[PDB]
Symmetry: C2
Subunit: 198 residues, 2 copies
């Protein structure tokens, strides 16, 4: 129905893993990471949510990943129960909720293949192409997250990510204007470094 606005500071938790899934959120400005942790501190980031993306939608009762703002972020949010009510009233709403979860599933399925099977360079080339599609403006990606967040998204250390980016820069495949301002100079070459579907 009606959304309400809210903002979170860089690094503020928006919800925790296993916390009640009481609201559903949409990024207006900024960026959010969703992740799971192990007890010794190892962290897998499952997804980055960028402006316009919806997150926190759960069919069940609890958030299965924690979510934190990467940088100061403004979101819109709606009560989960308000969505459940609308879905009951309107077959089209119910179908759109399922579609949202299905798109999350498709992203996770592709991401399992990356984490289980791709080389470090393939993973970084995949990542740069995904970000270019999602956030490039007039050819340039202003990436909101650190090298440690990129590594924890890709199942790699930040040093390996840095090394792959350095190599791509030396080869003329990308340009830098500072470490997180990246301009892809040849998407085709970079596409050739990811792994290809059978």
């Amino acid at each position: 129905l009606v959304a309400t606005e809210f903002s979170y500071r860089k690094d503020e938790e928006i919800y925790g893993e296993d916390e009640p899934a009481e609201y559903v959120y949409q990024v207006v400005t900024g960026a959010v990471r969703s992740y799971k942790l192990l007890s010794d501190g190892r962290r897998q980031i499952g997804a980055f949510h960028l402006p316009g993306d919806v997150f926190g939608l759960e069919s069940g009762p609890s958030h299965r990943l924690a979510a934190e703002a990467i940088i100061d972020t403004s979101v819109r949010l709606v009560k989960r129960s308000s969505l459940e009510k609308a879905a009951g009233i309107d077959v089209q709403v119910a179908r759109k909720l399922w579609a949202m979860t299905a798109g999350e599933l498709r992203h996770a399925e592709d991401h399992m293949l990356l984490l289980g099977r791709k080389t470090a360079m393939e993973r970084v080339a995949t990542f740069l192409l995904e970000m270019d599609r999602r956030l490039a403006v007039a050819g340039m990606m202003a990436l909101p997250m650190s090298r440690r967040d990129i590594g924890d998204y890709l199942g790699l250390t930040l040093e390996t990510v840095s090394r792959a980016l350095s190599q791509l820069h030396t080869q003329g495949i990308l340009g830098f204007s500072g470490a997180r301002q990246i301009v892809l100079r040849n998407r085709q070459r970079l596409h050739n470094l990811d792994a290809a579907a059978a």
Copy 2:
């Protein structure tokens, strides 16, 4: 509504990647693997579907993973269009379909953490515990798949999986009655070798 029966031989493809998602399936007997391939032959298994499990449900128009019988398998299946009609007629059907996809998402989220962050031994212990919960009979797991399928589910080589299983055996954690007949002797010790949540 009305399900029909069908069977597939060991290694027969049930549907391909990117193929039209025309039917939804439930294992009655046997076992199925869902996977994605890369062009050089590398393979990530996203899930094993065991008796009673439903698979091949897509919100979108096509299968995002291929599916193959691991051993001779009997399934029940229904037309996807038949499900879409029931879901339009009944709010609880629509809701169950969303819940199915959401359970697949929860599995894939956990599995990303495993593929991105768990050591080889943690992955194998996770796998044995998952299979014990889903398929043990009076304490013993008759695993339907090869070591190569296990490694492709866990982002490991079959040799690494063999070594971890050998080690668990030598430590008294599991028993063998042949390679794929496994009896967990101490689930607590094995749970301690998986990695724990924060």
